[PDB]
């Protein structure tokens, strides 16, 4: 996990071993950030977008930094065209897609594209919908933008991107309005975990099936959470960070796809929300 928020934006980069279970620090981020997204390309970990909500500022971030697990260094790469708080990111073929996010009162529909070989950014076609807190998942090398917030309404809609024609296509909407949900692909297709629908945080978790173009519910977690991190590696996806409306939650819940149960596995030293998570 990289970044996060508790009283202020955080520089924490700090891992967890579900095999061991203990918590230990690594190099801090260069600039504290929350509302960012994390992803891997070629083993390296890249923290993307966000903002630094601090006692002396609230600066939306257009930067992104690459970290290497071989040498514990964060190295700045080229920044985007605009800052993106509450961004969503998707990895196809080890390439970086930056989706939506906000800059001040502007809620982006713009999307950008980054190549770790070359280190650049270029604009692609805008989304149908402006989306901050948008969940982004990649499936069969298609880029999906799920839920979010357009500045007035929170969204249950989702849309798909085609890397060959620069066109966005609305698909079937989720059963639940979700902003700040945890969105990832597990096994077959797209999972949508938790989020905020404008009145409550969500523990219900939805799942999309592309062949049937159908969203179907799965067992809900024990504790609600929005602005959570999400990552896949060994199946059995965990949820880390978030917020339920009063306390910056301190639960790591684990959903098993076979028996479809949730149970709290562990906890890091402090509550936290708005993280960018990926695993190498």
């Amino acid at each position: 996990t990289a970044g996060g928020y508790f009283r202020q934006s955080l520089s924490y980069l700090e891992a967890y071993n579900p095999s061991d279970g203990t918590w230990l620090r690594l190099a801090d981020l260069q600039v504290p950030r929350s509302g960012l997204a994390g992803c891997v390309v070629g083993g390296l970990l890249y923290a993307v977008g966000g903002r630094n909500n601090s006692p002396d500022g609230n600066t939306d971030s257009s930067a992104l930094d690459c970290y290497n697990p071989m040498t514990n260094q964060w190295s700045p790469c080229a920044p985007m065209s605009v800052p993106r708080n509450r961004i969503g990111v998707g990895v196809i073929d080890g390439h970086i897609y930056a989706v939506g996010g906000s800059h001040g009162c502007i809620h982006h529909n713009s999307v950008e594209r980054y190549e770790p070989e070359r280190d650049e950014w270029h604009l692609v076609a805008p989304m149908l919908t402006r989306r901050i807190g948008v969940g982004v998942a990649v499936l069969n090398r298609l880029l999906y933008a799920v839920g979010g917030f357009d500045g007035t309404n929170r969204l249950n809609s989702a849309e798909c991107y085609y890397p060959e024609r620069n066109e966005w296509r609305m698909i079937t909407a989720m059963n639940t309005i979700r902003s700040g949900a945890g969105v990832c692909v597990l096994h077959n297709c797209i999972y949508a975990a938790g989020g905020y629908d404008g009145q409550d945080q969500l523990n219900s978790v939805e799942r999309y099936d592309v062949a049937t173009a159908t969203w179907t519910f799965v067992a809900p977690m024990k504790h609600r959470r929005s602005a959570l991190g999400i990552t896949v590696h060994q199946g059995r996806i965990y949820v880390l960070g978030g917020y339920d409306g009063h306390t910056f939650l301190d639960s790591v819940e684990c959903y098993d796809p076979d028996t479809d149960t949730w149970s709290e596995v562990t906890r890091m030293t402090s509550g936290r929300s708005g993280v960018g998570v990926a695993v190498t």
Partner: peptide, 9 residues
């Protein structure tokens, strides 16, 4: 503070 992520105004 803010309902979705808990960050301050």
């Amino acid at each position: 503070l803010d309902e979705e992520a808990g960050e301050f105004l």
